[PDB]
Amino acid sequence: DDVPPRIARAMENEEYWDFDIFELEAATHNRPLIYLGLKMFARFGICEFLHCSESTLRSWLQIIEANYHSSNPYHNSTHSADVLHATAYFLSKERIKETLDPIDEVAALIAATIHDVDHPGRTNSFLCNAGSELAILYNDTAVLESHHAALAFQLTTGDDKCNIFKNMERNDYRTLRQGIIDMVLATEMTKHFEHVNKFVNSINKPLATLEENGETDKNQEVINTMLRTPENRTLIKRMLIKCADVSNPCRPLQYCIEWAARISEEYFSQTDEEKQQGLPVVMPVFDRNTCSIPKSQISFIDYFITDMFDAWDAFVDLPDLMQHLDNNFKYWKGLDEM
Ligand SMILES: C[C@@H](c1cc(OCC(F)F)ccn1)n1cnc2c(N)nc(Cl)nc21
Ligand SMILES: [Mg+2]
Ligand SMILES: [Zn+2]
Protein backbone atom coordinates (compact mmCIF):
# COMPACT_ATOMS: atom_id res chain seq x y z
CA ASP A 1 0.00 0.00 0.00
CA ASP A 2 2.40 2.72 1.26
CA VAL A 3 5.04 1.89 -1.36
CA PRO A 4 7.56 4.37 -2.92
CA PRO A 5 7.78 4.69 -6.77
CA ARG A 6 11.10 3.00 -7.77
CA ILE A 7 10.44 0.07 -5.42
CA ALA A 8 6.80 -0.22 -6.64
CA ARG A 9 8.08 -0.39 -10.25
CA ALA A 10 10.82 -2.82 -9.13
CA MET A 11 7.98 -5.23 -8.15
CA GLU A 12 6.14 -4.82 -11.49
CA ASN A 13 6.49 -8.16 -13.30
CA GLU A 14 6.84 -10.38 -10.21
CA GLU A 15 4.69 -13.30 -11.43
CA TYR A 16 7.20 -13.57 -14.33
CA TRP A 17 10.39 -15.67 -14.07
CA ASP A 18 12.53 -12.89 -15.57
CA PHE A 19 12.25 -10.73 -12.43
CA ASP A 20 15.01 -8.30 -11.40
CA ILE A 21 15.59 -9.17 -7.71
CA PHE A 22 18.76 -7.01 -7.57
CA GLU A 23 16.85 -3.90 -8.71
CA LEU A 24 14.50 -4.63 -5.77
CA GLU A 25 17.54 -5.14 -3.50
CA ALA A 26 19.11 -1.84 -4.66
CA ALA A 27 15.86 0.15 -4.47
CA THR A 28 14.97 -1.26 -1.04
CA HIS A 29 18.50 -0.78 0.46
CA ASN A 30 19.04 -4.40 1.56
CA ARG A 31 15.39 -4.81 2.70
CA PRO A 32 13.66 -6.61 -0.27
CA LEU A 33 12.11 -9.49 1.75
CA ILE A 34 9.55 -7.33 3.59
CA TYR A 35 8.48 -5.62 0.33
CA LEU A 36 8.31 -8.78 -1.83
CA GLY A 37 6.92 -10.76 1.15
CA LEU A 38 3.90 -8.52 1.80
CA LYS A 39 2.83 -8.65 -1.88
CA MET A 40 3.31 -12.43 -2.22
CA PHE A 41 1.56 -13.10 1.13
CA ALA A 42 -1.34 -10.81 0.08
CA ARG A 43 -1.56 -12.57 -3.32
CA PHE A 44 -1.61 -16.04 -1.68
CA GLY A 45 -4.05 -14.80 1.03
CA ILE A 46 -1.85 -16.00 3.86
CA CYS A 47 -2.95 -13.69 6.72
CA GLU A 48 -6.58 -14.48 5.78
CA PHE A 49 -5.62 -18.17 6.23
CA LEU A 50 -3.52 -17.55 9.38
CA HIS A 51 -6.04 -15.00 10.80
CA CYS A 52 -3.29 -12.33 11.27
CA SER A 53 -3.36 -8.58 10.65
CA GLU A 54 -1.00 -6.82 8.22
CA SER A 55 0.77 -5.14 11.18
CA THR A 56 1.69 -8.57 12.63
CA LEU A 57 2.95 -9.70 9.20
CA ARG A 58 4.98 -6.46 8.70
CA SER A 59 6.58 -6.91 12.15
CA TRP A 60 7.22 -10.60 11.37
CA LEU A 61 8.88 -9.83 8.02
CA GLN A 62 11.10 -7.08 9.50
CA ILE A 63 12.36 -9.07 12.53
CA ILE A 64 13.32 -12.17 10.49
CA GLU A 65 14.82 -10.00 7.69
CA ALA A 66 16.77 -8.06 10.35
CA ASN A 67 18.38 -11.36 11.45
CA TYR A 68 19.68 -12.00 7.90
CA HIS A 69 23.33 -10.92 7.62
CA SER A 70 24.10 -7.94 5.32
CA SER A 71 27.82 -8.85 5.50
CA ASN A 72 27.27 -12.19 3.69
CA PRO A 73 27.45 -11.82 -0.13
CA TYR A 74 25.01 -14.65 -0.97
CA HIS A 75 23.20 -15.73 2.22
CA ASN A 76 21.23 -12.56 2.99
CA SER A 77 17.57 -11.38 2.83
CA THR A 78 17.81 -11.05 -1.00
CA HIS A 79 18.55 -14.78 -1.35
CA SER A 80 15.49 -15.76 0.72
CA ALA A 81 13.37 -13.25 -1.22
CA ASP A 82 14.73 -14.82 -4.45
CA VAL A 83 13.90 -18.27 -2.99
CA LEU A 84 10.46 -16.90 -1.94
CA HIS A 85 9.94 -15.72 -5.51
CA ALA A 86 10.93 -19.15 -6.93
CA THR A 87 8.70 -20.92 -4.37
CA ALA A 88 5.67 -18.72 -5.18
CA TYR A 89 6.35 -19.25 -8.92
CA PHE A 90 6.31 -23.06 -8.47
CA LEU A 91 3.10 -22.91 -6.38
CA SER A 92 1.49 -20.93 -9.24
CA LYS A 93 2.23 -23.83 -11.66
CA GLU A 94 -0.82 -25.93 -12.61
CA ARG A 95 0.62 -29.29 -11.48
CA ILE A 96 1.51 -27.88 -8.04
CA LYS A 97 -1.76 -25.94 -7.60
CA GLU A 98 -3.93 -29.03 -8.24
CA THR A 99 -1.60 -31.47 -6.40
CA LEU A 100 -0.88 -29.55 -3.18
CA ASP A 101 -3.49 -28.02 -0.83
CA PRO A 102 -3.82 -24.40 0.50
CA ILE A 103 -1.97 -25.29 3.76
CA ASP A 104 1.10 -26.46 1.76
CA GLU A 105 1.22 -23.16 -0.19
CA VAL A 106 1.46 -21.30 3.15
CA ALA A 107 4.05 -23.76 4.53
CA ALA A 108 6.27 -23.39 1.45
CA LEU A 109 6.11 -19.58 1.38
CA ILE A 110 6.89 -19.32 5.13
CA ALA A 111 9.59 -22.03 4.87
CA ALA A 112 11.31 -20.22 1.97
CA THR A 113 11.16 -16.88 3.82
CA ILE A 114 12.97 -18.27 6.93
CA HIS A 115 15.12 -20.99 5.29
CA ASP A 116 18.54 -19.31 5.86
CA VAL A 117 17.81 -16.91 8.77
CA ASP A 118 20.96 -15.87 10.68
CA HIS A 119 23.21 -17.71 8.19
CA PRO A 120 26.86 -17.10 9.25
CA GLY A 121 28.25 -17.19 5.65
CA ARG A 122 29.67 -20.64 6.45
CA THR A 123 28.94 -24.37 6.01
CA ASN A 124 27.94 -26.94 8.65
CA SER A 125 31.32 -28.71 8.37
CA PHE A 126 33.17 -25.44 9.08
CA LEU A 127 31.10 -24.88 12.24
CA CYS A 128 31.94 -28.40 13.48
CA ASN A 129 35.67 -28.00 12.67
CA ALA A 130 35.83 -24.41 14.02
CA GLY A 131 34.11 -25.51 17.26
CA SER A 132 30.97 -23.39 16.99
CA GLU A 133 28.34 -23.16 19.75
CA LEU A 134 25.68 -24.32 17.24
CA ALA A 135 27.71 -27.47 16.41
CA ILE A 136 27.71 -28.37 20.13
CA LEU A 137 24.02 -27.38 20.50
CA TYR A 138 22.87 -29.30 17.38
CA ASN A 139 25.42 -32.16 17.75
CA ASP A 140 27.14 -31.77 14.33
CA THR A 141 23.85 -32.80 12.66
CA ALA A 142 21.89 -30.37 10.43
CA VAL A 143 23.50 -27.52 12.39
CA LEU A 144 22.32 -24.54 10.32
CA GLU A 145 19.09 -26.19 9.11
CA SER A 146 17.98 -26.79 12.71
CA HIS A 147 19.16 -23.30 13.74
CA HIS A 148 17.21 -21.53 10.94
CA ALA A 149 13.83 -23.06 11.79
CA ALA A 150 14.49 -22.91 15.57
CA LEU A 151 15.48 -19.23 15.53
CA ALA A 152 12.60 -18.46 13.14
CA PHE A 153 10.11 -19.94 15.66
CA GLN A 154 12.01 -18.35 18.60
CA LEU A 155 11.56 -14.92 16.95
CA THR A 156 7.94 -15.48 15.83
CA THR A 157 6.22 -16.96 18.90
CA GLY A 158 8.37 -15.22 21.56
CA ASP A 159 6.76 -11.81 20.86
CA ASP A 160 3.04 -11.08 20.33
CA LYS A 161 3.77 -8.35 17.73
CA CYS A 162 5.67 -10.95 15.63
CA ASN A 163 3.46 -14.03 16.28
CA ILE A 164 1.69 -14.69 12.95
CA PHE A 165 0.50 -18.10 14.30
CA LYS A 166 -1.40 -16.78 17.35
CA ASN A 167 -5.04 -16.72 16.11
CA MET A 168 -4.97 -20.19 14.40
CA GLU A 169 -6.38 -23.48 15.67
CA ARG A 170 -3.82 -25.41 17.77
CA ASN A 171 -4.16 -28.56 15.61
CA ASP A 172 -3.85 -26.56 12.35
CA TYR A 173 -0.71 -24.79 13.66
CA ARG A 174 1.01 -28.13 14.47
CA THR A 175 0.28 -29.38 10.93
CA LEU A 176 1.62 -26.13 9.41
CA ARG A 177 4.60 -26.12 11.83
CA GLN A 178 5.62 -29.68 10.87
CA GLY A 179 5.31 -28.70 7.19
CA ILE A 180 7.65 -25.72 7.67
CA ILE A 181 10.14 -27.70 9.81
CA ASP A 182 10.22 -30.51 7.22
CA MET A 183 10.90 -28.14 4.29
CA VAL A 184 13.52 -26.06 6.17
CA LEU A 185 15.33 -29.28 7.20
CA ALA A 186 14.97 -30.60 3.61
CA THR A 187 17.45 -27.93 2.35
CA GLU A 188 20.57 -29.77 3.66
CA MET A 189 23.22 -30.91 1.14
CA THR A 190 24.03 -34.43 2.47
CA LYS A 191 20.50 -35.76 1.73
CA HIS A 192 20.38 -34.46 -1.89
CA PHE A 193 20.38 -37.78 -3.78
CA GLU A 194 18.23 -39.33 -1.01
CA HIS A 195 15.40 -36.85 -1.76
CA VAL A 196 15.91 -36.82 -5.57
CA ASN A 197 15.79 -40.65 -5.86
CA LYS A 198 12.53 -40.72 -3.88
CA PHE A 199 11.00 -38.06 -6.19
CA VAL A 200 11.81 -39.94 -9.43
CA ASN A 201 10.76 -43.35 -8.00
CA SER A 202 7.62 -42.32 -6.05
CA ILE A 203 6.16 -39.73 -8.46
CA ASN A 204 7.66 -39.59 -11.97
CA LYS A 205 7.96 -43.36 -12.68
CA PRO A 206 4.38 -44.23 -11.51
CA LEU A 207 3.08 -41.08 -13.27
CA ALA A 208 4.92 -42.16 -16.46
CA THR A 209 3.24 -45.60 -16.17
CA LEU A 210 -0.21 -43.96 -15.88
CA GLU A 211 0.33 -41.76 -18.96
CA GLU A 212 1.83 -44.81 -20.75
CA ASN A 213 -1.28 -46.94 -20.04
CA GLY A 214 -3.63 -44.19 -21.29
CA GLU A 215 -5.55 -41.12 -20.10
CA THR A 216 -9.11 -42.12 -19.12
CA ASP A 217 -11.39 -40.47 -16.52
CA LYS A 218 -11.04 -43.38 -14.04
CA ASN A 219 -7.25 -43.54 -14.58
CA GLN A 220 -7.14 -39.77 -13.86
CA GLU A 221 -8.51 -40.32 -10.32
CA VAL A 222 -5.83 -42.99 -9.65
CA ILE A 223 -3.15 -40.43 -10.67
CA ASN A 224 -4.76 -37.82 -8.37
CA THR A 225 -5.16 -40.38 -5.55
CA MET A 226 -1.47 -41.41 -5.81
CA LEU A 227 0.09 -37.91 -5.82
CA ARG A 228 -2.23 -36.26 -3.26
CA THR A 229 -1.36 -38.87 -0.57
CA PRO A 230 0.30 -37.15 2.47
CA GLU A 231 3.57 -39.07 1.84
CA ASN A 232 3.91 -37.89 -1.78
CA ARG A 233 2.80 -34.29 -1.01
CA THR A 234 5.72 -34.10 1.45
CA LEU A 235 8.03 -35.48 -1.30
CA ILE A 236 6.84 -32.72 -3.68
CA LYS A 237 7.29 -30.02 -1.00
CA ARG A 238 10.88 -31.23 -0.46
CA MET A 239 11.57 -31.17 -4.21
CA LEU A 240 9.95 -27.73 -4.49
CA ILE A 241 11.91 -26.10 -1.62
CA LYS A 242 15.17 -27.72 -2.82
CA CYS A 243 14.67 -26.54 -6.43
CA ALA A 244 13.75 -23.03 -5.25
CA ASP A 245 16.86 -22.90 -3.01
CA VAL A 246 19.17 -23.51 -6.04
CA SER A 247 17.19 -21.96 -8.94
CA ASN A 248 19.92 -19.40 -9.82
CA PRO A 249 21.47 -21.48 -12.65
CA CYS A 250 17.97 -21.39 -14.26
CA ARG A 251 17.73 -17.55 -14.17
CA PRO A 252 18.26 -14.92 -16.92
CA LEU A 253 22.02 -14.80 -17.62
CA GLN A 254 22.77 -11.51 -15.82
CA TYR A 255 21.18 -12.84 -12.60
CA CYS A 256 22.83 -16.29 -12.86
CA ILE A 257 26.32 -14.75 -13.07
CA GLU A 258 25.63 -12.38 -10.14
CA TRP A 259 24.43 -15.31 -8.00
CA ALA A 260 27.47 -17.41 -8.99
CA ALA A 261 29.91 -14.66 -7.96
CA ARG A 262 28.15 -14.09 -4.60
CA ILE A 263 28.25 -17.75 -3.50
CA SER A 264 31.78 -18.08 -4.95
CA GLU A 265 32.88 -15.09 -2.83
CA GLU A 266 31.36 -16.75 0.28
CA TYR A 267 33.21 -20.03 -0.28
CA PHE A 268 36.48 -18.13 -0.85
CA SER A 269 35.92 -16.14 2.36
CA GLN A 270 35.43 -19.43 4.25
CA THR A 271 38.52 -20.93 2.56
CA ASP A 272 40.63 -17.93 3.66
CA GLU A 273 39.57 -18.46 7.30
CA GLU A 274 40.11 -22.25 7.04
CA LYS A 275 43.70 -21.56 5.94
CA GLN A 276 44.14 -18.67 8.42
CA GLN A 277 42.88 -20.21 11.69
CA GLY A 278 44.41 -23.65 10.94
CA LEU A 279 41.35 -25.75 10.07
CA PRO A 280 40.90 -28.76 7.74
CA VAL A 281 39.96 -27.57 4.24
CA VAL A 282 36.54 -29.16 3.57
CA MET A 283 36.17 -27.22 0.28
CA PRO A 284 39.64 -27.11 -1.37
CA VAL A 285 38.53 -26.39 -4.98
CA PHE A 286 36.78 -23.15 -3.87
CA ASP A 287 39.87 -20.94 -3.37
CA ARG A 288 40.10 -17.34 -4.66
CA ASN A 289 43.70 -17.95 -5.84
CA THR A 290 42.89 -21.12 -7.91
CA CYS A 291 39.11 -21.50 -8.58
CA SER A 292 37.78 -21.02 -12.10
CA ILE A 293 34.22 -19.84 -11.40
CA PRO A 294 33.10 -20.68 -14.98
CA LYS A 295 34.41 -24.26 -14.63
CA SER A 296 33.04 -24.65 -11.07
CA GLN A 297 29.56 -23.59 -12.26
CA ILE A 298 29.65 -26.20 -15.05
CA SER A 299 30.59 -28.85 -12.46
CA PHE A 300 27.93 -27.55 -10.05
CA ILE A 301 25.26 -27.81 -12.77
CA ASP A 302 26.45 -31.28 -13.89
CA TYR A 303 26.71 -32.91 -10.46
CA PHE A 304 23.54 -31.62 -8.72
CA ILE A 305 21.29 -29.28 -10.71
CA THR A 306 20.69 -30.97 -14.09
CA ASP A 307 19.30 -34.29 -12.78
CA MET A 308 17.27 -32.50 -10.06
CA PHE A 309 15.55 -30.04 -12.41
CA ASP A 310 15.12 -32.86 -14.98
CA ALA A 311 12.89 -34.70 -12.49
CA TRP A 312 11.20 -31.46 -11.35
CA ASP A 313 10.64 -30.23 -14.94
CA ALA A 314 9.07 -33.57 -15.97
CA PHE A 315 6.56 -33.07 -13.14
CA VAL A 316 5.82 -29.30 -13.27
CA ASP A 317 6.88 -28.33 -16.85
CA LEU A 318 9.32 -25.40 -16.57
CA PRO A 319 10.41 -24.60 -20.18
CA ASP A 320 11.84 -21.14 -19.34
CA LEU A 321 14.05 -22.50 -16.53
CA MET A 322 15.39 -25.31 -18.75
CA GLN A 323 15.84 -22.84 -21.64
CA HIS A 324 17.74 -20.53 -19.22
CA LEU A 325 19.69 -23.50 -17.76
CA ASP A 326 20.96 -24.52 -21.23
CA ASN A 327 21.82 -20.89 -22.13
CA ASN A 328 23.83 -20.28 -18.94
CA PHE A 329 25.57 -23.68 -19.26
CA LYS A 330 26.67 -22.65 -22.78
CA TYR A 331 27.82 -19.21 -21.54
CA TRP A 332 29.99 -20.79 -18.80
CA LYS A 333 31.47 -23.09 -21.51
CA GLY A 334 32.05 -20.07 -23.79
CA LEU A 335 34.55 -18.44 -21.38
CA ASP A 336 37.38 -20.81 -22.45
CA GLU A 337 38.39 -18.59 -25.44
CA MET A 338 41.75 -20.40 -25.95
C1 LIG B 1 23.96 -22.93 -1.28
C2 LIG B 1 25.02 -23.41 -2.27
C3 LIG B 1 25.09 -24.92 -2.29
C4 LIG B 1 24.16 -25.68 -3.00
C5 LIG B 1 24.31 -27.06 -3.02
O6 LIG B 1 23.33 -27.66 -3.77
C7 LIG B 1 23.36 -29.08 -3.95
C8 LIG B 1 21.86 -29.44 -4.06
F9 LIG B 1 21.16 -28.84 -3.05
F10 LIG B 1 21.34 -28.93 -5.21
C11 LIG B 1 25.37 -27.64 -2.35
C12 LIG B 1 26.22 -26.81 -1.66
N13 LIG B 1 26.10 -25.47 -1.61
N14 LIG B 1 24.75 -22.88 -3.63
C15 LIG B 1 23.62 -22.25 -4.10
N16 LIG B 1 23.71 -21.87 -5.35
C17 LIG B 1 24.97 -22.28 -5.74
C18 LIG B 1 25.68 -22.19 -6.95
N19 LIG B 1 25.17 -21.63 -8.06
N20 LIG B 1 26.92 -22.69 -7.02
C21 LIG B 1 27.41 -23.26 -5.92
CL22 LIG B 1 29.01 -23.92 -6.08
N23 LIG B 1 26.86 -23.42 -4.72
C24 LIG B 1 25.63 -22.90 -4.69
MG1 LIG C 1 20.80 -23.42 3.63
ZN1 LIG D 1 19.36 -21.48 1.07
Give yes or no for residue 86 CB within 6 A of ligand 1.
no
Closest Cα to atom 6 of ligand 1:
189
Q: How far apart are CA 35 and CA 38, in angstroms?
A: 6
Q: How far away, in angstroms, is 122 Cα from ligand 1 center?
A: 12
Asked if 165 contacts 57 with a C-beta cutoff of 8 angstroms, the reply is: no
85 catalytic residue (yes or no): no
Give which of 33, 115, 121 is closest to 75, Cα–Cα. 121
Is residue 248 within 6 Å of ligand 1 at its C-beta?
yes
Give CA–CA dist 75/68, Å, rounded. Answer: 8
Distance (angstroms) between ligand 3 centre and the Cα of 70 equals: 15
Q: What is the resolution of this structure in A?
A: 2.8
Question: Alpha carbon of 147 to those of 3, 104, 182, 183, 314: distances in Å?
Answer: 33, 22, 13, 13, 33
Neighbours of ion ligand 2 (CB under 5 A): 116, 187
Q: How many residues does the chain have?
A: 338
Ligand sitting nearest the alpha carbon of 282: 1
Q: Mark out the alpha helices in the chain (DSSP H runs).
A: 5-10, 21-28, 32-44, 46-50, 54-66, 77-92, 94-99, 102-114, 124-129, 133-137, 143-158, 170-185, 192-199, 205-213, 217-227, 230-245, 253-277, 293-300, 306-316, 319-334
**What is the rounded CA–CA span in Å between residue 115 and residue 67?**
12
* Single-letter residue type at 34: I
116 is in an annotated binding site: yes
Task: Establish whether 118 is an annotated binding residue.
Answer: no
* Residue 117 alpha carbon to ligand 2 centre in Å: 9
Give the method of determination: X-ray
Q: How far apart are the first and last CA of the chain?
A: 53
**Contact status, residue 266 vs residue 72, Cβ threshold 8 Å:** yes
**Nearest atom of ligand 1 to the alpha carbon of 308:** 10
